[PDB]
Amino acid sequence: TLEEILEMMEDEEFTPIIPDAVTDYYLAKNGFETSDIKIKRILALATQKFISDIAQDAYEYSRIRSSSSNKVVLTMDDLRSALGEYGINVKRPNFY
Partner 1 sequence: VRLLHLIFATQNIYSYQDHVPLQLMDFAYRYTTGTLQDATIYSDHAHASNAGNAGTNAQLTTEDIRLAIAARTNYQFKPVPPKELLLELAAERNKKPLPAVIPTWGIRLPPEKYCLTGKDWVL
Partner 2 sequence: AADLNRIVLEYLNKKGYHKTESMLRMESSHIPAPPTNIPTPQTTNISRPTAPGRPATIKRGYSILKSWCESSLDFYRPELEKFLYPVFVHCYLDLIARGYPSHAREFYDKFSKDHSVLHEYEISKLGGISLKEHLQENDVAKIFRSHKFKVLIGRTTFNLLLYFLNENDAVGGGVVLRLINQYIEPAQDLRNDIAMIQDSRAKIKLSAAQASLPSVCMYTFHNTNNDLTCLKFNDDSTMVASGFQDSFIKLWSIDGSPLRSLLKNDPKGSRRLVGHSGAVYGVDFSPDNRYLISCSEDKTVRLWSLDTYTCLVSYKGHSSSVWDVKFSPMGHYFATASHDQTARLWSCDHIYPLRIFAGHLNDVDCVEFHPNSTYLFTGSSDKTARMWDIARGECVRVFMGHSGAINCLAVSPDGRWLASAGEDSVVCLWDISTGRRIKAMRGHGRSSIYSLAFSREGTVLVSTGADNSVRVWDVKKNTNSPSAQPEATNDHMSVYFTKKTPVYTVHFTRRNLCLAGGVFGG
Partner 3 sequence: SHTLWSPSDTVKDAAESLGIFNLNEEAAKNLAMDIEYRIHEILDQASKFMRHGKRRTLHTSDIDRALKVLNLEPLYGYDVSRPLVFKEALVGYVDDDEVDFEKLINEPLPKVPRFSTFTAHWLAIEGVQPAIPQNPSPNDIKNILPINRGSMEISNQKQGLEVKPLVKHVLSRELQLYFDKIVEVLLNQEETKEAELLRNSALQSVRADPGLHQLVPYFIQFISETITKNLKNISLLSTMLELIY
35 touches partner 3 (CB under 8 A) = no
Nearer to partner 1, 72 or 90 (CB): 90
CB 41 within 8 A of CB 9: yes
Q: What is the DSSP letter of 11?
A: S
Binding site for partner 1 (CB under 8 A): 6, 32-36, 39, 90, 92-94
x/- mask, partner 2, residues 27-66, rule CB under 8 A, reads -xxxxxx---------------------------------
Cα separation, 58 vs 25, whole angstroms: 29
Cα separation, 5 vs 38, whole angstroms: 9
